[PDB]
C-alpha cells in the first residue's frame, strides 16, 4: 500500500486540562460529558425522534417561542446562519446587514455568495444599532431581510432588540438575529420581540460541544422560504427537507441526512440543564458574574472596551489591550502559566481587544478570580514596549 | 415567561440498547464511546491542531492518498458531497452523474441547485457503470466532473473503480467518488485509482458517531477549485477557508468556523482503530463477514438482490423482499422483538429490498447469526398475504 498506518495515530489520545475562558467553546459539565460517551441508537428510530422532539421543546424554551418550525442544524453557528440566508434570500433580494463586527461581516459574505443585493450598515467595533439607523436603512434599501447580531462576541456588545421586529414588519422586512453568544446569558424573547429567524449555537452558554446549532423561523419567514421561485443553493440546508425530518410539517418524516445522534444526546442534556436552572436564573448568574469580572479587570487598571455598562454583553467581555503590550504575549502567558484560554480580537476588533468568556457553568466568580490572577501576572511579566 | 421549562427535559436521558445492523449508523466500540466522553480543549489550540493533523494522516491512510488537501467536513456525508460539488462546479459546468441509486440522485439534486448542467446516466436499482458507458457519457456531454458511487448502499452494489480515473482524465474530466459506505470495507486506492475527489462518512465502517465526513482533493481538483471566477455558493463549505484552517496551505490558520472538537476526538480514535487493524485486514473481515451473511440469508430461502456476486457490496447487503410480506412488518418485527435495526430500501430501492449492514466492529459472525435468527423469526411470525 502507498501509505502505511500513521505512527502518531498508534499513540493514545491525550488531552490537556484547559479552563476555557474565551468566547467559546466552553468547558463541559459532567452530564454533558456523560451523554457524549453513550452508545448509538438508530438515527431514524422512534427513540431518536423522541429525543429530537424534546430538543425542539428545549429550543422553544430557551428562545421563548411557540414557532413549530424550530429545529437543530447539523453544523456550527455559521451553518445555522447560512441555513437562514440560503433559505430566506433569493438572488436579487435586498438584504440589510448590521455590520458592526465579524458576525455581520460574515452575513455580508454569505449574502453576496448567494446573489443577494447586500446593504451593510457598517459601524465601528463597539457600536450598536438604533431604531433610527435601521429605519434609514429600511427606507433606503427596502430589504426583504435584516440581520442583527444580538451578542456581538467579537466586540463585546449587547445589541438592544426591542422595537426592531415591529419596525421591520411595517416595512415588510424579516428580522434575523444571531443569538449564538447571548442565548442563556441575557434576556431574549423571540416571539415577544417579533424576531422572524433566530439562531444560536451549542458551545456557548449552553456548554454543549460545538458542532450543532439551534434555529427557529416565524410564520412570516416560513412563507418566504416556502414560496421561493428557485430552490435554495444548498440541499444539506434546505429547510423544507429539514422541517419534514424534524417533525415540523404535517407529513411523516423522510430521510434527508443522518443527524449527529451523539451530539443530540449532549445537546438534549444541555437544554435539560438550563431548563432545570431556569432562564431568568441563568440570566442572573451571567449578569452578576460579568459585573464581578468588570470590577476585577478595572481594579487591574484594565479598561473595558464597551464603555456603557448597559451595552456590555455579559457572556463575552472585551478589554482594551493595555498600552505597550503585545496582546499575543498576554494570551500566551495566560495559557502557558495558568492553563486558561482567553482570546484576542476577531474581525474588526483584531488587535484591539482581549476577549474573556463567561459561559454557562463556567460563568462563576471562581473563574473570574482565576483569570484576573492570570492577567495580573501577565501584566507584570509580559514585556512592555 | 411565554414558554415554561419542558417537563420532559427534567427527566433523565435514557437510551435503549440497540444492535444497529442497517446501512448506518453503526454501533460504537468502547474506545470511541470513551473518546466522546472527554473534556473540551480550545478549538484553535496547538493541541487541537495536532489532533487535526493526526486525523489528516489517518484520512490519507484509509483513502490511500498523499493529497495535502485532505480534511474533515463539519457535517454528515451529504455535507461532504455538497462541499465537493459547490467548490468544483461553477454555474454552467457540465456534470456527469452515475445515477444508479439515491446517492447519484442526490448528486443530481445538488448539481441542479448550484446551476450545473447535469447529465444523469440513469440506471435502475442494482445497476452499475461500465467503462464503455462512462466513456459514452464523457464523449457526449464533455463534463468537467463525473460522480460515481463506489458503495451504493441503497442498492447493495459495489461499483468497480479501476480505470475510471484514467478514462476521465483522457477527457479532461475530474473523478469524484462517494465512498461513504465502502471505505474500510472493500478495496479503495485514491491515488492509484486516479480519483480526484474522494469522500466518506464517519458513521459507517469507521464506527464513529455520525456528523463528520472525510474528503480529499487531488491537485487537478484543487486547480479547478482555486481557478474559478465565481465564489462558491457556500461560505461554510468554502474549500479555500477550510484548507487554510486545516493547515493545507501556506498561511497561518485563520478562524473560519468552530470545528466539532469532541467529534474529532472520536473520529481520531476511529482512524486509530482501523490503522491498528490494517486496511487490508479490515477488507478481509468485511469480505468474509458478508460471504457468511450471504450464505445464511440464502439458507433462509431469501434472494440476494444483486445477482452478480462480484457486484455485491460487503458493507451493505440488499435482500429481495420475499413475496407475500410487507417489508415494514419484517423490519418492525426485528427491532420490536430483538432490538436489532435493519432497513428497507431507500429512494429507487424503496419497497424492493431489505438492507443489512456489516460495518466495522459490527461485521462479525455473531451479528450475522443474530440477524439471521431474527429474520427467520420474522418470516415465521409476520403476516403473509393470503
Ligand atoms: C455571536 C456568534 N455568532 C456566530 C458564531 C459562529 O459560531 P461557530 O464558530 O460555531 O460557527 C459565533 C462563534 C458567535 O459568537
Ligand atoms: C454511500 C453513501 N453516500 C452518502 C450517504 C449519506 O450520508 P449522511 O446520511 O451521513 O449524510 C450514505 C448514508 C451512504 O451510504
Residue numbers in the entry:
A (entry chain A): 6 to 390
B (entry chain B): 6 to 391
What does the paper behind this entry write?
AGT is a hepatocyte-specific PLP dependent enzyme, belonging to the Fold Type I family, catalysing the transamination reaction between L-alanine and glyoxylate to produce glycine and pyruvate, thus leading to the removal of glyoxylate. AGT normally localises in the peroxisomes and failure of its detoxification role leads to increased levels of oxalate, coming from oxidation of glyoxylate, causing calcium oxalate precipitation in the kidney and urinary tract. Many pathogenic variants of AGT cause PH1 (primary hyperoxaluria type I), a rare autosomal recessive disorder. Our results shows that two forces generated by the salt bridge between the conserved aspartate residue and the pyridine N1 atom, and by the Schiff base linkage act as opposite springs and are responsible for the fine tilting adjustments of the pyridine plane of PLP.
On the other hand, it is known that radiation damage might reduce the Schiff base linkage and significantly alter the internal aldimine geometry in a PLP dependent enzyme, especially if the initial geometry is distorted. Therefore, a complete X-ray photoreduction of the Schiff base was hypothesized, to relax the geometrical strain of the internal aldimine. Consequently, when the Schiff bond is broken, the C4′-Nε distance increases from 1.5 Å, observed in the early structure, to 3.0 Å in the late one, the optimal distance for the 1,3-protortropic shift to occur. In particular the photo-reduced structure (late) shows that, once the Schiff base is reduced, the interaction with Asp-183 alone tilts the cofactor and brings it in a productive distance (about 3 Å) for the subsequent 1,3-prototropic shift to take place.
